[PDB]
Design an enzyme around this catalytic site. Sequence first.
Site, PDB file in Angstrom:
ATOM      1  CG  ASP A 124      70.515  13.026  25.905  1.00 56.19           C
ATOM      2  OD1 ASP A 124      70.353  12.235  26.971  1.00 56.19           O
ATOM      3  OD2 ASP A 124      70.748  14.326  25.732  1.00 56.19           O
ATOM      4  CD  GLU A 182      67.811  16.387  18.641  1.00 50.97           C
ATOM      5  OE1 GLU A 182      67.790  15.310  19.200  1.00 50.97           O
ATOM      6  OE2 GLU A 182      67.969  17.323  18.960  1.00 50.97           O
TER       7      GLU A 182
END
EC number: 3.2.1.17
Length: 454
Positions: A28, A19
């Site tokens: 994202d 992440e």
Amino acid sequence: DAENLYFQGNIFEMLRIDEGLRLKIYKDTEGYYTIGIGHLLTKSPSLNAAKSELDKAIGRNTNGVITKDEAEKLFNQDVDAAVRGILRNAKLKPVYDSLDAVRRAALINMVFQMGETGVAGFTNSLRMLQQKRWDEAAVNLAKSRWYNQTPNRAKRVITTFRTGTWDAYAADEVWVVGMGIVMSLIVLAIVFGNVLVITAIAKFERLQTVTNYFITSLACADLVMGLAVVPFGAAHILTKTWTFGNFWCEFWTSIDVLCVTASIETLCVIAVDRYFAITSPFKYQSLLTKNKARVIILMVWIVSGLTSFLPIQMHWYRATHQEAINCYAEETCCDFFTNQAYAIASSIVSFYVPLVIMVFVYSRVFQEAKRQLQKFALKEHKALKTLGIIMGTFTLCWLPFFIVNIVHVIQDNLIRKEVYILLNWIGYVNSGFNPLIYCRSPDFRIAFQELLCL
Ligand SMILES: CN[C@@H]1CCc2c(ccc(O)c2O)[C@H]1O
Ligand code: NA
């Protein structure tokens, strides 16, 4: 237990790699609003709906930016919730128990990214992990939507399922010490080379020329780089915080722009210096007295001191967005944030004005070589190679950064913070390359032979 070496095995550090930590809202790989360490904010594509969930989930007006503390608490909450979802689920609870420690993390990793309902959809692959058919689930999982969208993160988790070891992630720790020892070699080189150059001109009379006075000032800026700028930056990147308080953060920032300006503005003075010493050699010695050169030295350091310490130590350089205001208040944050006025004006005074002057005179040095009193000879390709290195080194080192230094304030989140730092370090090593370029004279060659062997 009794394991306090580097890279313990846990879902915490595994997810921290897939992440990455980001304090400001970002989209994202798919385009969903995310903050912190892989924290899904909302599926609504309006940034104001993302801030609303974030402000409720933090209990504060975040303006879309959280602190490193808040991110760590959303990380654990999201991790501690993935596990709760695994235990509340009928397809996940048996497989989770059946899994060993390292493969449990791989299961939590998927639930962290897709929720209890989504991971429970892999009916066949979970059935394969149930009967411990790892290699068969590794093939099956690599045929899904999840693998198609994030193949790198999937391939790591799929490998963690297959082998049952951290091999897909443990390789990350070799890149930490590899970067660290390289940083040390850089610090040693810069301090070694430039302390040698400053010593050679300070102790020897055959090297006390005017061109070398500019060499001395160049070596002075480069010495401070290896002694002051680079070591603190190495401690910053490795520790991943800043441990010297808020005042020394800006002072370190101030001494950075001081040296990089003085370094490049001196390379500009040397380029012009040699243009006069080569094309008009007789007036070059009548006009440029040793005092006139010292005055030119002071101009570089007064210009540099005015473009580095004056703005920074007066907070003029500061940005105004939320991540910037947090970093100026957070004692452990020393990330670099500026406004458009400073990020532009400095690049002109530090890099672009010197760059243009240099591209001008060096090209003119060779255009005036043609219109002399005279045959495809060999000393002209030798000299054409020499200035190619003088110009090719300086360009490949600093030009990538100062272009990026301009872009990162034109269209935000176009230049990753990671890259802006790498290209900045690619510029720092120019201070080590400089003694290997402007000190190749027979006088210098002898000074360096006597200063080391005898
Ligand atoms: C912290 N690194 C700084 C960031 C920006 C910058 C540098 C050097 C000279 C400048 O004129 C700058 O604007 C870099 O060394
Ligand atoms: Na700060």
